[PDB]
Amino acid sequence: GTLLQPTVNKFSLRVFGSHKAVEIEQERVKSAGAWIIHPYSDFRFYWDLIMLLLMVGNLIVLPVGITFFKEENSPPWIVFNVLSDTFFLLDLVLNFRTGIVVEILLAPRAIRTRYLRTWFLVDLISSIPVDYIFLVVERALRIVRFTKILSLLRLLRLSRLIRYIHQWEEIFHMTYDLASAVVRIFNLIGMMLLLCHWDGCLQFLVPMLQDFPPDCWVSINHMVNHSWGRQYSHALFKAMSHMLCIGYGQQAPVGMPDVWLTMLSMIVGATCYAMFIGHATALIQSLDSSRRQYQEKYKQVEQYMSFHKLPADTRQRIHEYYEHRYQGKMFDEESILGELSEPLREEIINFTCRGLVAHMDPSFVTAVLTKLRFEVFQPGDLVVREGKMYFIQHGLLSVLTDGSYFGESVRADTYCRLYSLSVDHFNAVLEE
Amino acid sequence: GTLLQPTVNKFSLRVFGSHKAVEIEQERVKSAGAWIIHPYSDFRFYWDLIMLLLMVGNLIVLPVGITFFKEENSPPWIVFNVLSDTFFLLDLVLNFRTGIVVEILLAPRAIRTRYLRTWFLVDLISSIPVDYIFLVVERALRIVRFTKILSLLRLLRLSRLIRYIHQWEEIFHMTYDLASAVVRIFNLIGMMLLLCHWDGCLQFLVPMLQDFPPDCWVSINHMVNHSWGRQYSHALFKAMSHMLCIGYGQQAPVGMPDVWLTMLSMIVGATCYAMFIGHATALIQSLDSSRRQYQEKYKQVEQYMSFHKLPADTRQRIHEYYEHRYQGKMFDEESILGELSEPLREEIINFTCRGLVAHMDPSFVTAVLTKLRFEVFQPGDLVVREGKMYFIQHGLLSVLTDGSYFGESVRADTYCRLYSLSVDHFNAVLEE
Amino acid sequence: GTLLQPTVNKFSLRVFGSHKAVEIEQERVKSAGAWIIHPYSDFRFYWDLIMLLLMVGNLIVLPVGITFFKEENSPPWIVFNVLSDTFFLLDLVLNFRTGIVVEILLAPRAIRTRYLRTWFLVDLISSIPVDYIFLVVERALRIVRFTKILSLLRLLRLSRLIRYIHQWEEIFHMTYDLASAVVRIFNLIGMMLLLCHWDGCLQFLVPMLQDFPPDCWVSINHMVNHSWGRQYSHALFKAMSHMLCIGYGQQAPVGMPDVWLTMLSMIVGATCYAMFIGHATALIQSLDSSRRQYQEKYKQVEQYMSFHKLPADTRQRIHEYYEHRYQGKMFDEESILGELSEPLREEIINFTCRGLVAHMDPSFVTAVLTKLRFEVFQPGDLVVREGKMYFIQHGLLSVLTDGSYFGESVRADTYCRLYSLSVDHFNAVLEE
Amino acid sequence: GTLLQPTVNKFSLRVFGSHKAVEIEQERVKSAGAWIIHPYSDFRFYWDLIMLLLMVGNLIVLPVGITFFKEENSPPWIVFNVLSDTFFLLDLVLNFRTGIVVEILLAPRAIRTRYLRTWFLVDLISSIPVDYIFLVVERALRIVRFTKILSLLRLLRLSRLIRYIHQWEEIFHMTYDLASAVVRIFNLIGMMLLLCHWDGCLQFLVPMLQDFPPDCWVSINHMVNHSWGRQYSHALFKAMSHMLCIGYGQQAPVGMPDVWLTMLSMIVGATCYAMFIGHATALIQSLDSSRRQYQEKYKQVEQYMSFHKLPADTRQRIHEYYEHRYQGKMFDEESILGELSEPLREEIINFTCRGLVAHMDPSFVTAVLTKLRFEVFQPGDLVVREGKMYFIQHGLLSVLTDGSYFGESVRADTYCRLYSLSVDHFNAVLEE
Ligand SMILES: COc1ccc(CCN2CCC[C@H](CN3CCc4cc(OC)c(OC)cc4CC3=O)C2)cc1OC
Ligand SMILES: COc1ccc(CCN2CCC[C@H](CN3CCc4cc(OC)c(OC)cc4CC3=O)C2)cc1OC
Ligand SMILES: COc1ccc(CCN2CCC[C@H](CN3CCc4cc(OC)c(OC)cc4CC3=O)C2)cc1OC
Ligand SMILES: COc1ccc(CCN2CCC[C@H](CN3CCc4cc(OC)c(OC)cc4CC3=O)C2)cc1OC
């Protein structure tokens, strides 16, 4: 009976904190006197995993089944509709009982009023079979067309599909690290494919209800008596050619329901393609930002060069210095060491340094190693004046190899990475 | 008589300041000797609310009424034009008297010269009925076509509609918080729909004035003697197919007014669709910026990892530390507490802290609570050396539960959020 | 004779500095022994103003004059070509003598070698009349077509037009403040219009050289014997329909020069329209950046709210505080006062402050006024504890009106903007 | 035998460091007991330079050779296929032996398992001639069509081409400074051209296998018995018209393989063009960032002006100050001097300063020159009060010329750039 309560996962510990907050939430669920269903429990997961599959199945199969087929009295179609109505009614019954993340777990007052205020009507319309009631209660062709238009009320399950998809993918940013633009662009691709699939069925459906006039494209292309696969292929081609702004037929369209459907599909396709270009741009601009911020910083540097009118050899020397200091990449070594915790910084220092001070109290050694600084030099650029202590990591130094010190005229022969521990910090560590 | 003066609203207090500045502005309006109209008063609001509705009504109805209908001597059309001319003349009379935000409320000198210099001519042209004067003063078909082209001068009210819309939506950024890109993109959508509606009427209007030559599309499609709804539908379809860059008919266009109108509508549609893509991109890039700045910062962090060639276990340990420190979100807790005022920071501290120091002078307690710091640790990462005081918010610590202190070998067993009050700040508070 | 030397303008003082650097540059021009022409002088300006007009005139008139007209032996055409050849030869002669901004004013060595290395050949080809030489030196229709293809070598003046336009608009960023994206987008619009105008003439030119085969569109549309205006209109419509990716005719194109010209114009139009979308996006993203950085900062603030799980009343109180502190706008008052000079800051302080300290040594007053700080409070938020001095700019305070002080239980009744001069800074000013 | 080992280049010194790390890597390659091939050596470079040329040659020639030609038994075709199979088998043999940058140079364990896990199958399929085996082992037209479909398995060499191109261009960001967006956009242009070239051959290939039905476009346009150049031109035109979303023929397509190929090419072309717009936008936004950050900063400055309601003369004075301080360009002179090394800063100071202190111990002079600060003033803005030392670089000062000092009422007549060395720093240098 603990399936209604939230368990102890990585997600529950990231949301609530320690195990004590999770046990407080479990006692809070068990304290409201009901069979209350917590929205992070396993039961909602196992239920919505079934419901998303049934939603995708219905939203793909139902327009093709309504429009293209002739006799709607086949047995597996009726079985399919009855089972879909049963599950989408039980999901409404459980939506009476679930918790709402704003977590409002008060069953008799908060959940009922919040569900009746926001999303009861759309789920109630999309749940029950409306057409079969009118068939039991009740010029037969007008009745059949009216029942087809009533049976197209099943497509209001998209408002539930969007809600459950947004809930699960809002959960799954915390269990796993995900790029946001990828999630947004695949959500948009799914929406675009679903809209194109609906426009195909709609552009066959509208000449269908008029008993195929001689002006429509179906009668012109002489394709009334083919199979449903051929008709679906041509209708989907027509819908995709209107959606991607192509230009379909020989003539301009003649009938009045053709013109307005054409214009509607053109507007929907143009807006969807504009949002697709926007998501593609937002995804491309976040691939190599570390190689872009360095470029902007070097633009500012050469602007500083141009403001003071420096000679050309000095400018190419600055260029070589930044190439061998940052290596085409932007990072701030002060703030990164500022943000971290202390023994993890001790680990990073014990990896990088603390092997160069092997020659000549461990806590004294760690304090000296924390008191260091990183420097990059250049050949010809001599560092000492005749009349601050260094260590050598790389490069050549003439007055040597990797690893030495200058105990208190030294010229750099190549690119050298050095360290420094200048005597004020050393005296502070001696005081410690 | 106080309707001409600005009242005391949320907007007036955000603009001018206290009530004293508002009373100074009211005395300034009452001191200029006139019936001067202040541009933030209620009278301009109640006037422009009527004028925007009349502008939308005229700019939708008038091209359809001029082009498609045959006899323009129906009585309600003349009544509609007379009432529109009356209101758009009275609006000119009141635009002589209004104040101008640059607020220049000097009536006889500043307002008259500024209005005559900038926008008197366009409002004067779009105000008066030009066609009826030529009809009273004055080959009859050329006269009727000339009066239609003169009656198309009513469409210079768009320059007033743009001005009033920009004034009100510049006001309504301060009464309510609004995203800027939403306002920009709905302004562009309104402009695009209005331009498409005008291109439809224009592409029926140009074959209309030539007594329908046999080369034009109206004579080819055999649609001279249909109703005006059918003709408007086909003309709007042709205009939208040129605007969205489709490709309309079987043949290339033949007549010379067809080719240049076609090219003009193609260029206008291409530029409008490019600006729509630009606004859509600018709106998409401002949805999840807090989830993007964290991504860029972590790119810089892993670049810092790659610059010093750290081992893989240390890199995944940094990754886990940032996941459980920032939780996929960028914020700077130092600058946010820097920007705020002092007792509001005392409120935030009294909510978060000041319950953990419940065990063991209230001002002393508030000073100690302001002297705290926030820390996040990791399991295995022990924090103390044998031979600074902490508090526990979450996690487990072995040598415990949530809430304890280390009064002056402690190992973190899980993710722990701790506090710190190191003895220098404590001695400063003891000095206070 | 001083027209060859740079004068004293706003631009010369912004580039070189004081008048002494300008006089050094004038002596440098007069010291190189030549009639050397400095590239910032008035003579190059007055010369290039003529040359840009002749370039636009030639690059518009010459393709229409070559392709559509039949007899090329009219007198004003020959006069026009002779005068154009004369001016574009004299411009080459002066390009031997001008200075080069890299300013290299050394005449006999630097300028000649740099001009012969980079851009001598293209200007030499586009300068001289090539076709008339072949006409004097030399199946007549092949000769006429060959002279037309040789006379199309005049269109290599675009490489000079681009160079002079970039030089002048690089100059005119410093004389006047200009948005960069506006300059870029109008340069692109000019290039796109010129390319479309060339594609029209080219798509009439290619069927022209083949003596109008029956497969081409000119023979199909029966438009060989119309005037040149009709043919230019249809050719430009065909070129613009290929460029904006429309779909032109009934059939697919049949001949082989039609297909490759069609594909070439489609590729050029697609790339130009993509760069136009890019420039439009870059222009839109730089209109309301100050209203966007505030939005991003408030996203970070509400993220900081969500990280610590604050109550709702505190969150809306932070929201009201930022609305009445920054007013939907981002600025940093510390760094702006950091960047400025000292007496200008004294001017800003003497405007804002120094009227509130009117009640109760002027240098002492200026030091106290520099030692102030700006604060914003909130109603209910009382500021003093029973048992730092303030000034009042706005709001109401109960224990008052605008302008008072607290000389060393005060409750804010409304939004209050206050000042502060806490006693350490006051003691430092007393020490001064 | 040292060609398998990495040599000493600029790239090897930038990657590994000094010469000692390179010699350690050479001893590491020579210590694994094999003929192991290091992935940065010269041998992989000289091998992949041949392999990229063979890949481009095969991926251009093979679809045109399979589809359009009739008899595939010509001798140079068989020689070409045999040589291509030989080289792409030897490349597999060497891919067994190469090192893998993750550098894993362990031959018998790491490389074999990593290559068998990731990319053995695709290279094995694309290496061997599959069709000739079925021809040796084995209604003849079905056999010929089946061998053509088997011989189209050679096009899985694109997965190797992408890998080698990404490896070399990841190497060549470090040998030379390159803009990233240029590399990305030319990679995308190459991919788009290759996909269009494949769609042309595919849209001729599909009617080819059906023995040219009368519904297809080849039989309609009466182009079965032309040469292969004409057929390739029309097929590539059809593929490019579907890819750029044009609208190709008179009728809608009739056959079922036509419709789905048409829709597939439309979707691929739309996605490629959207990514091209994204790369073009990302390239345009990185051209003039230094002229954009100044614009954003000045927006913040004028917002700070509007927040405090400053007079207009003060606002234009701030505008003139920023124009003559930053010159339309953003840079931070403190952080740039912070990032650099010390003797290079001494070089920059010795260029800019140290000529103005020529009048009135060299180390003392360098310390005073490091203790300076840069200031910009304005005419009318007098700087001294009657009752800090300066130097003059430009401008005029009345109580002069360029270069003077104020040894401890001076009015600036023009724009002046000055220096400062205020007495605390001078006393510190005297202490040094
Ligand atoms: C070291 O431990 C491991 C680390 C990493 C891994 C690899 C695990 N992988 C990490 C990336 C996410 C992926 C699956 N995922 C989640 C489920 C889901 C469901 C959706 O339907 C609502 C959805 O809607 C768009 C989007 C998504 C997003 C999504 O992609 C699982 C395995 C590990 O060990 C097993
Ligand atoms: C707690 O107090 C409340 C807080 C919040 C609310 C919700 C109030 N809502 C907040 C958002 C704006 C909206 C209406 N709005 C303003 C009027 C207008 C007119 C225009 O024509 C010129 C226009 O042109 C584009 C654009 C707009 C923008 C616009 O959308 C009103 C109610 C509250 O209590 C009643
Ligand atoms: C208070 O003093 C004043 C302040 C301000 C003004 C308004 C003066 N205005 C300021 C904006 C620029 C404009 C003209 N301009 C320069 C000439 C040019 C030539 C080009 O051809 C190469 C070009 O190529 C794209 C682009 C441009 C850009 C361009 O627009 C002149 C007047 C004032 O007093 C007179
Ligand atoms: C002062 O010393 C010099 C400084 C500068 C120079 C100019 C040298 N130049 C600098 C820019 C890169 C260019 C060639 N380059 C590298 C090779 C390659 C191969 C590719 O195939 C995989 C590729 O795939 C997209 C992309 C690229 C990128 C690319 O453009 C060489 C010369 C110098 O002296 C000789």
Your description of this structure?
4 copies of one chain form a homotetramer. Chain A is mainly alpha-helical and 432 residues long. Chain A folds into 4 domains: 1-169, no CATH class; 179-287, Helix Hairpins; 290-326; 341-431, Jelly Rolls (Sandwich). In chain A, 62% of the residues lie in helices and 3% in strands. Chain A is built from 19 helices and 5 strands. In chain A, the strands form 2 sheets. A 3-stranded antiparallel β-sheet of chain A has the order 1-5-2. Chain B binds chain D through residues 246-247, 277, 281, and chain D through 246-247, 277, 281. The complex binds the ligand COc1ccc(CCN2CCC[C@H](CN3CCc4cc(OC)c(OC)cc4CC3=O)C2)cc1OC (4 copies). One ligand VXI binds next to helix 9 and helix 10 of chain A. Chains A, B, C, D: It is found in: Cell membrane. Chains A, B, C, D: Residues 70-75, 209-231, 254-263 are extracellular. Chains A, B, C, D: It is a multi-pass membrane protein. Chains A, B, C, D: The chain crosses the membrane at residues 49-69, 76-96, 119-138, 139-156, 188-208, 264-284. Chains A, B, C, D: Residues 232-253 dip into the membrane without crossing it.
SSE order and pairing:
Four copies of one chain form a homotetramer.
Chain A: H1 10-16, H2 19-31, H3 42-67, H4 75-95, H5 107-118, H6 121-127, H7 130-137, H8 140-151, H9 158-171, H10 180-208, H11 217-220, H12 228-243, H13 256-284, H14 290-308, H15 312-326, H16 333-339, H17 342-352, H18 362-370, E1 373-376, E2 390-392, E3 397-398, E4 411-412, E5 417-420, H19 423-431
Antiparallel strand pairs in A: 1-5, 2-5, 3-4
Bound molecules: the ligand COc1ccc(CCN2CCC[C@H](CN3CCc4cc(OC)c(OC)cc4CC3=O)C2)cc1OC (4 copies).
One copy of the ligand COc1ccc(CCN2CCC[C@H](CN3CCc4cc(OC)c(OC)cc4CC3=O)C2)cc1OC binds at residues 165, 168-169, 172, 176, 183, 186 of chain B.
